[PDB]
Amino acid sequence: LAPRQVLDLEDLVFTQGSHFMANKRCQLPDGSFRRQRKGYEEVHVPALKPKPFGSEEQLLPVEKLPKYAQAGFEGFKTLNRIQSKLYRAALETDENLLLCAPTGAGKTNVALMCMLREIGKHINMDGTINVDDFKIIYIAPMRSLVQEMVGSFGKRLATYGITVAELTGDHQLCKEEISATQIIVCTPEKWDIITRKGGERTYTQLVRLIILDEIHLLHDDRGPVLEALVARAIRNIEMTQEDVRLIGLSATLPNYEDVATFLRVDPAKGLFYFDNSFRPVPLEQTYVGITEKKAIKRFQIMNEIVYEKIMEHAGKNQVLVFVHSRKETGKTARAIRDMCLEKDTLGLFLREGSASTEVLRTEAEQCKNLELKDLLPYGFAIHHAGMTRVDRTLVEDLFADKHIQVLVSTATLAWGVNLPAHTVIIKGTQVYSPEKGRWTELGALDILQMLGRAGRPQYDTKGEGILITSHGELQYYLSLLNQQLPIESQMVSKLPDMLNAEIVLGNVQNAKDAVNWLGYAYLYIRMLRSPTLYGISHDDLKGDPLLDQRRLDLVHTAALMLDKNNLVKYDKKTGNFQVTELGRIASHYYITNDTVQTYNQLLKPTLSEIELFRVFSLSSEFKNITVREEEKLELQKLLERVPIPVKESIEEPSAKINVLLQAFISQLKLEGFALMADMVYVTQLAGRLMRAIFEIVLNRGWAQLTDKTLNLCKMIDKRMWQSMCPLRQFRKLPEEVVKKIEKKNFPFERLYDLNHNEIGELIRMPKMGKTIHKYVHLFPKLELSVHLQPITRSTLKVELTITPDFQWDEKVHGSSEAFWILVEDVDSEVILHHEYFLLKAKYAQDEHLITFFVPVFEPLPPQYFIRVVSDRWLSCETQLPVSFRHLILPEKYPPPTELLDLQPLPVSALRNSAFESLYQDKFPFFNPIQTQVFNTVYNSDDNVFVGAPTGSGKTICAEFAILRMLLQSSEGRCVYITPMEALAEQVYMDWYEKFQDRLNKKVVLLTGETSTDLKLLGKGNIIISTPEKWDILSRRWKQRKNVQNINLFVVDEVHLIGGENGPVLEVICSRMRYISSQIERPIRIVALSSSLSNAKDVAHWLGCSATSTFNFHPNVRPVPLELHIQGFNISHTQTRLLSMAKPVYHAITKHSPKKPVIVFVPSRKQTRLTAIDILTTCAADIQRQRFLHCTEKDLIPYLEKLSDSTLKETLLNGVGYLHEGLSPMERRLVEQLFSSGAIQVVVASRSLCWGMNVAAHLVIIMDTQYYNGKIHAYVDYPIYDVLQMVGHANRPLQDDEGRCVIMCQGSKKDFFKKFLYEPLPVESHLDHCMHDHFNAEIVTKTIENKQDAVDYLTWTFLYRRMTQNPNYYNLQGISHRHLSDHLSELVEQTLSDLEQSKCISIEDEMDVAPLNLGMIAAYYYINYTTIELFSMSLNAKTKVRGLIEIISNAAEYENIPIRHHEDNLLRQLAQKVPHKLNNPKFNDPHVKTNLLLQAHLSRMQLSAELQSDTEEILSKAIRLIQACVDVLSSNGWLSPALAAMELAQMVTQAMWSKDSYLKQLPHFTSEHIKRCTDKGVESVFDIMEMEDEERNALLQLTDSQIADVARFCNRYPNIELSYEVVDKDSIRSGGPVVVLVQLEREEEVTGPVIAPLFPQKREEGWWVVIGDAKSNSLISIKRLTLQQKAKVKLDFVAPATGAHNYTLYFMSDAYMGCDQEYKFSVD
Ligand SMILES: Nc1ncnc2c1ncn2[C@@H]1O[C@H](COP(=O)(O)OP(=O)(O)OP(=O)(O)O)[C@@H](O)[C@H]1O
Ligand SMILES: Nc1ncnc2c1ncn2[C@@H]1O[C@H](COP(=O)(O)OP(=O)(O)O)[C@@H](O)[C@H]1O
Ligand SMILES: Nc1ccc(S(N)(=O)=O)cc1
Ligand SMILES: [Mg+2]
């Protein structure tokens, strides 16, 4: 890299700040005349005549202006002279503009027209405007001007339904008032703070137009912030490639074109410059400089000059005087009034208009305080911001209405309000500047503004500007006000802070990045056009025209500064930057680097509040504050009144600052001017600086100093010491009241126990007694509850339940309340864990559960402490000791099985050549894991456990066991179970083409349906299944032989046993252990797993011996892993995500710049977005297509088969993505391209980490939480899901290593740092899912009594772990006795619950038996509570409406997710469905399924994920409906039962109860029905009996339409029924009555049931039913499948005597309207 040079930075800089002039000479216009007065020199320049109207230079009227821009212009008939040249520029082009004009010329309306244009392209046809589509930024230099603008602009655009809102000050992470607004108005340094925050593209993404008002501020010491701002923005336009319009508004000053360059303005098309001949009113300006320095006489001289100047106006004229003190307005107004009453008493009577009128108006307003009463009767008045109230806005009135004759006012009036005067006289021009620590000349920006108020636009002809100042070196002002003071760049002054900001953002990563950034600065353009002025020689410039040396030297110098102060780690060699937490905080809280060093140096855990106050005063933003003599006395008084001792700071500036702050909190009235100005300064800085110290110390875990610092933050905010009364924080509560309660030695906590009457009776003030009670209960108060379960001997899982215990009030609490959860050691010295909890208003009084892990150490202490502290409220916290007194730590886990460094095992150890073949073509030798394992699995016929990290090759370890089975047995059968369906389908693909193609042995994959699955188990050598599918088969293992005689049983990913749905896995694996040892032909168990801590427990459970148990440590992983965990201390997920964007790219380029990359993101929407970001970042880096490793031409043939539109675009750029909205085809395509090498990067959603057969070199996990709409919260990725993600970063054949970067919220970092490197512990949750499996065992009669239930548990993993980690399973005791006790108390509850729910019967306490409800739940695999609710909610008159409600309330649909902002989506659907729901809470999955079910019936296409959810719903719908039939028929109800069967078919075909049966046929629309309704065809029976020529002539056909419908009626069941009553003649009461039903189809043709709008491929089902229609009674029932010919018998019992009238029913569960009816009689 290039050599660098350390720079004398202080030399290169412009020391004079805004006052600096590289102006040299100064030419005056034609009026030159100088009128000396010995004591002071006078200089005049005359008003300018107005330039001539050019050829076709007319003034455009609003009439001609576009009809949509008319609004916001009532109050205007025509356009200004300036505004005419710019109408095309502003409203007809999107070109960047730079406008220069006299202040007052009307540049603002030009900015307004530009706004209108951006609004112009959001007109939305009928709907008036697209308010939520865009945003405009208006950057103004003064807070007073901003509020002025929000006012004016707010009126204009109110007719557009558009909102413009203020946003400047101390707004840290602003509220949703910025998300609602469309025009943001603010100051530079505000906007800078916002766009530094890392999460910024949420405020700025929508921003289409930003406006820089008074951009000459560039010249000021605030100048850099503008440069920083614009450089930052411009660079972003390049990155996102989203065009943003820049508009500059400046005053007529030199260098304007350099500024236009800076703004990327086209000199030909966007530069508009208007010299001072374009003023609103022509200006007669007068400048006077006091020659002599007699300072007392100075005021006397100065006040004499104002005197005579005012006199030359009197009766008809109006004067404005500007001075520079809140109190100087009063002095001056009275000083002149007395002056002109003792110096020849020149008439104030000469002032009051007429001879004595309007004097009564000025007297009728005289009843107002603040020395205004004294001036108003006369001709004088005053205006200042400082504490002036409504009077301020009334002096404004009378001046504007021309009653007030002489107004002297502070500068803020020039910005705050548009009231101009005929003549303006600026007095003195000196200002006390706190940060400079002295008196200096005021800003060039301020002078211009106020002196631009000379002459009222509609009532004046000439304006008179008088400028009184020092003669000494202030011809500078002539330069300013006559187009001659040049605009320079002040960047060097603020370089290292400005650099640091970008570094923290990720915008610059190295000196090179930096040096490029500098090129965006106005600094760069000036150094070019004026190199000598900036210390560059003419010779350097010609040799280095792009200033590559200087910009690197500049950067290098500032880099060393940030390094010295530890804001940034920088090495001179590579030139790379690393960001530190110190520099991160620095940038975020806007504090200079030198301060951060001081804090880093002085802070320490044991800091006292005394030393704390000391430290704050060493802040470098105070480095200029001195202690003046004229204020030493008053400081001494303050020091004696303030509470915190100030050591030996004595009369140093440190002491001054320290007590100034204390005085502020004590609310001490101050007296000394300047001393007040100083106080204001350190107080506004005090929030940030403290909050910064808080974060520094929070992060280091310093418990005590964290508490001190947060409290100090709150004292400054709430202006009260910590000892005072919490009630003071209520600002609407009489301050004498609070003083009364304070002086009582009374503890605040005791106020909660008193009522309004007792309160007053103790304050001795019975009036306020009731309103205090109101406030006490408004005060934030939380209850904390804790639950503990130890994980290892080093970490415990803590479940904190916070519960709000107060009344909410949006005018007191706002929309939320922030807290900090702090968990600390016994000594309360260390913060062990911490996180930020946010109580949103909507969910106040709602339960909040917070989970997290904490470290524990060898000899445990009694307790830890959880403290929950308000972020804003003083004396507002809640503490909770977490006792360890009864804590039993789990047993020490055994070491990992050692990795023997055996020499690698070649494929030749496998003998069989048909075997070796499917391996030899792949890899040369076996990894150290497979070699070590081999011997035991391929040679032995016994049980074995393998525990290695994912990516280690355990799959083929399992395959070893399978080869042996095929070797040892001809048609042997092995069962293989993976916990995930997407994994099941992955192995089946691998194994089918491995075992049925290569080895010619049938390989099968189980499905939902029982009958067809039974068949597959039969013909299969290799069986593949998820645990749930295998459970419903093996549940009846007695009745099924094929389950019993299986040779081999492989369990993969057995660590998932500790996850959700872990129970079912554990139950089946135990069922195999039970069976195997119960038939004496031992089944071989082979279990594969991630590295376990407690593998001994698993092996002993599954029959493995220690030796044949292979649990390796994660470091054993064949491809070594490089893990990096990157925390983000950002709580708001959307923000966290957005600020992870740049770090994702930067990670690719660092860790895997060439090799492939997978990025996981939490959602489908994120998947598309992150991809697009990577592209745009890439193209901005000038790379464009560095992730495409083929040519675009090569891809076209594949991308032709894509319809997504956008991954077509992204893949073309080398980046793909994956979610579940993509077609299975679209997925396969993308994966293929990735494995091939064509694309380097795919972004996949978290859900697809299980369904991906793709490996990268680098895996990036972007955030680790997903939103769960049910509990309105974000929840963590299961560790299982993350272990998997990381496994994707291994490619054994191509990389020397795998790399993983996890990006997570900071509160999560420490958790990942343990459970990724170390082995994993696992527990059972069988006990929390114990009912359904017991209920099934009692049905199968494996559990015949209570003892058998205890015996059954002895085969489970649960049984092993209860002894090893008792507190996890809440075994309050320890071992041996408590164990038998707890087992028996567990079986007791479950049987009780099952008995109470009608599922089982308990007889003699010991014995159990299945009941009806229990039989139906075991059969259909339905949770027992579902059928409890089914039998509880189904009556005699339930119809298909109530049936849907009941079925959707199934416990099965509980797990249906509610995603972010679907509550708005579901709310819409509800007001669009046939059957309305009452009180339907839209975070309830049941409410969701209910609507999603109607939408499916109503053939509605909707959101992608909703159709995707509908699929998971329908997938369980059938078994649920069938269950309902069973219950209604078990209860003898006729009506509901039949309607329930209708539901079964109408679900399958997706149609309603009275929808035309014509909808069963493909391609038919709702209009095709009425062209058959009128025609005479309203049935499917009709279209089958009419000839073919007449059939296709009916409606519109195609060749492929005829093909689909033909095959439809080749499977539409043809029905005919014959029946006889056996012994029809001889039948009596109480005797059996047999009805023999004959069934046969004539189709002969059969096949898969066609129901296009149904995700499952289901089979035909039929119910034959007998009932009494008259009395609503179901008499007999039988379900079957046709098989072409069938004989169904079903008998019942006869009534007392006579003959009855019955009905015979024949219903389908699949097709609509095949149903037959028959009336018959017996006896
Ligand atoms: N001896 C070997 N040499 C090189 N590559 C191998 C070897 N054995 C397996 N592989 C490959 O390594 C990849 C990872 O192996 P595998 O899928 O078995 O991981 P695992 O450790 O079993 O965990 P999981 O199966 O849960 O991902 C597979 O794609 C496989 O093809
Ligand atoms: N077409 C117009 N008709 C009447 N008044 C105008 C017109 N254009 C601008 N003005 C007035 O000129 C005054 C000063 O102009 P402003 O828009 O504040 O820009 P600037 O002061 O930055 O030049 C404003 O009070 C505004 O009302
Ligand atoms: N300021 C801050 C925000 C969030 C977090 S954390 N640890 O909850 O993510 C810490 C500090
Ligand atoms: Mg595996």
Curated annotation (Swiss-Prot):
Changing R235A: Strongly decreases ATP-dependent RNA helicase activity. ATP binds at residues 101-108, 948-955. Changing R201A: Strongly decreases ATP-dependent RNA helicase activity. Its main location: nucleus. It catalyses: ATP + H2O = ADP + phosphate + H(+). The modification Phosphothreonine is found at T1026, T1363. Widely expressed. Its EC number is 3.6.4.13. It is found in: Nucleus. Residues 88-271, 935-1110 form the Helicase ATP-binding domain. The modification Phosphotyrosine is found at Y307. Residues 1-1723 are annotated as: Interaction with C9orf78 and WBP4. Residues 282-519, 1143-1351 form the Helicase C-terminal domain. It is linked to Retinitis pigmentosa 33: A retinal dystrophy belonging to the group of pigmentary retinopathies. Retinitis pigmentosa is characterized by retinal pigment deposits visible on fundus examination and primary loss of rod photoreceptor cells followed by secondary loss of cone photoreceptors. Patients typically have night vision blindness and loss of midperipheral visual field. As their condition progresses, they lose their far peripheral visual field and eventually central vision as well. Belongs to the helicase family. SKI2 subfamily. Component of a core complex containing at least PRPF8, SNRNP200, EFTUD2 and SNRNP40. Component of the U5 snRNP and U4/U6-U5 tri-snRNP complexes, building blocks of the spliceosome. Component of the U4/U6-U5 tri-snRNP complex composed of the U4, U6 and U5 snRNAs and at least PRPF3, PRPF4, PRPF6, PRPF8, PRPF31, SNRNP200, TXNL4A, SNRNP40, DDX23, CD2BP2, PPIH, SNU13, EFTUD2, SART1 and USP39. Component of precatalytic, catalytic and postcatalytic spliceosomal complexes. Component of the minor spliceosome, which splices U12-type introns. Catalyzes the ATP-dependent unwinding of U4/U6 RNA duplices, an essential step in the assembly of a catalytically active spliceosome. Plays a role in pre-mRNA splicing as a core component of precatalytic, catalytic and postcatalytic spliceosomal complexes. As a component of the minor spliceosome, involved in the splicing of U12-type introns in pre-mRNAs. Involved in spliceosome assembly, activation and disassembly. Mediates changes in the dynamic network of RNA-RNA interactions in the spliceosome. This is U5 small nuclear ribonucleoprotein 200 kDa helicase. The lineage of its organism: Eukaryota, Metazoa, Chordata, Craniata, Vertebrata.
